Structure 1
């Protein structure tokens, strides 16, 4: 009860910043997460023993893939911690509890393949979940782990509070399907620009939490350039493996996933920054002004990809 987690000085200070990198020491990531729950939520949010047991079972159900791994889970949770800490009073007690858990669980049991590849392979998951195939799976794995003996971190919530947190988590995880992001952000854009955006409207809060989820999920584009650039290598390691698997089914993959077309990575990143990332962090900064450092870091990284195209690196 009187048992705080503390981090070395450099981590204690830098964990508060949006651009923090959790480091290569995998054994410190559980402690980094508990630290973030304790400051984001309270030392009373969860029973330490149950929380530690839940975190370790979550870790075990992430696979050893290049990008969609346990380091991604914790990295996405840290970006959410930073958003929550920079917007103290905007979020309910249930939201603070649900959202870091949602982030840690959002890619549970990912295999490193897109929803498209599962549909083309005719994977059993594509028949069970016809849209947002992997995201429905991640939510199903989250509920599984919550139901293991000694893993109910929400045990002290009422029946209706438990149902509300699991609904915050389900929507937060589904929103990480990028196919859903474009429309969500366009509706947020219209609501903000016509002044209809209302944070007391639940369907509005849902959209705003969805956009937060996209922002945390893409937060590799908000790091210092050496982090962004090295993470890109892991992102493509997966895409190119999916491309190989498309070729094995006798389907030419899109260029993004074709390793023969590596040369065009720099221009592919520009499109991504301009069509996805910048719009994401722009709309987020309009709704939640203290998230502006994410947009500034994204713009700094777009400018570094522009330098790569100009052969200046």
Structure 2
């Protein structure tokens, strides 16, 4: 029998299958363990432990280890953000239009990639790491610096004591899982955005459907690019969440950006675009960002899974008009 706090946490976790879970409340209730508890809930919810023979304590140990490698003093790019994207991907996976499409392995990869996609994020951008001549930048030859590091770290952690949650997968399963996870995480790099969206639009144009309205994806290219856009959507899903959640996310990312702005000035690096704490229209940046990136993307997704994303798209448009007022 759980403590009262655990019971309250548990009643919150009953919303796991719903857009708008109050992830910040879960983070509070769980003693800053939103990623661990949300992942554990999803894995049990999707029967992943049985299917892949994952020992539960190995799962817990890894999860806790993973979460510990997110930075608590990073305003946005932290374990709470990881948890959010995990659960969001989780919801997108359950969309009616994609029912019975993806194998258990592919689901496992989409969720695991979500969990690790930002681990050990230092709270500054690729360009900042490149311009400071940082070790990380030189390791990854300035290309997808953070994203390569997230992957390397997330896999490496499997080697810590009692952390290998994939210890029972066959070599075939592990090689396939790993490639999918790598393709998914590298695609979270925003510099890949336009091309990702190009492929997504192209697939909407050529969209096919079989037996009860469910999408058809008959080659790795198509299947992986869908999962890639799905996680990228989860990663840019803040403006589609209830305004209460969206506003908290905006505060956090702007706090992070201004911190980077401060660090840039403390050294006379050119103050990044809209990273200047003194001259910034948060409201205006959010609208432009929605019009130019978030809405085109979500609208395209909505077409792929029509009409499943209708409410998410409505919410995004509502939050867009709201921020517009604010100006």
Same fold (TM over 0.5): yes
Question: Cα offset for 1:294?
Answer: 2.7
Alignment pair present for 1:223 and 2:230: no
Say whether the 8 Å CA contact 1:40–1:96 is kept in structure 2.
no
State the SS of the aligned residue for 2:160: coil
Say whether the 8 Å CA contact 2:196–2:229 is kept in structure 1.
yes
TM-score after normalising by structure 1:
0.90
Alignment pair present for 1:82 and 2:83: no
For 1:42 and 1:127, the matched residues in 2 are separated by 37
Q: Could you tell me which residue of structure 2 aligns to residue 167 of structure 1?
A: 179
Question: Cα offset for 1:10?
Answer: 5.0
Question: Cα offset for 1:293?
Answer: 3.2
Q: Could you tell me which residue of structure 2 aligns to residue 285 of structure 1?
A: 302
For 2:30 and 2:325, the matched residues in 1 are separated by 33
Q: Could you tell me which residue of structure 1 aligns to residue 127 of structure 2?
A: 116
TM-score after normalising by structure 2:
0.87
1:178-197 CA-to-partner distances (Å, cap 9, x unmatched) read: 11011110122123224489
Q: Could you tell me which residue of structure 2 aligns to residue 33 of structure 1?
A: 39
Q: Could you tell me which residue of structure 2 aligns to residue 103 of structure 1?
A: 114
Question: Cα offset for 1:198?
Answer: 5.9
Q: Extract unaligned runs of 5+ from structure 1.
A: none
For 2:12 and 2:252, the matched residues in 1 are separated by 26
1:78-131 CA-to-partner distances (Å, cap 9, x unmatched) read: 001111122331211101112211111110100000001001111111111121
For 1:301 and 1:191, the matched residues in 2 are separated by 28
Q: Could you tell me which residue of structure 2 aligns to residue 57 of structure 1?
A: 65
1:141-178 CA-to-partner distances (Å, cap 9, x unmatched) read: 01111122321111111101101111111111111111
Q: How does 1:163-242 map to 2 (within 5 A)?
A: 163-195=175-207, 199-242=217-260
Match of 2:284 among 267, 272, 284: 267
Query: In structure 2, do the counterparts of structure 1 residues 218 and 195 end up closer, same or farther at CA, with 3 Å as the change threshold?
Result: closer
For 2:10 and 2:268, the matched residues in 1 are separated by 52
4+ residue runs of structure 1 moved beyond 6 angstroms?
none
State the SS of the aligned residue for 1:257: coil
Query: In structure 2, do the counterparts of structure 1 residues 8 and 230 end up closer, same or farther at CA, with 3 Å as the change threshold?
Result: same
Q: Could you tell me which residue of structure 2 aligns to residue 16 of structure 1?
A: 17
Query: In structure 2, do the counterparts of structure 1 residues 215 and 41 end up closer, same or farther at CA, with 3 Å as the change threshold?
Result: farther
Q: Extract unaligned runs of 5+ from structure 2.
A: 1-5, 209-214
Say whether the 8 Å CA contact 1:223–1:297 is kept in structure 2.
yes
Aligned residues: 303
For 2:206 and 2:13, the matched residues in 1 are separated by 41
Say whether the 8 Å CA contact 1:284–1:291 is kept in structure 2.
yes
RMSD: 2.0
Say whether the 8 Å CA contact 2:48–2:108 is kept in structure 1.
no
State the SS of the aligned residue for 1:16: coil
For 2:64 and 2:145, the matched residues in 1 are separated by 25
For 1:286 and 1:214, the matched residues in 2 are separated by 16
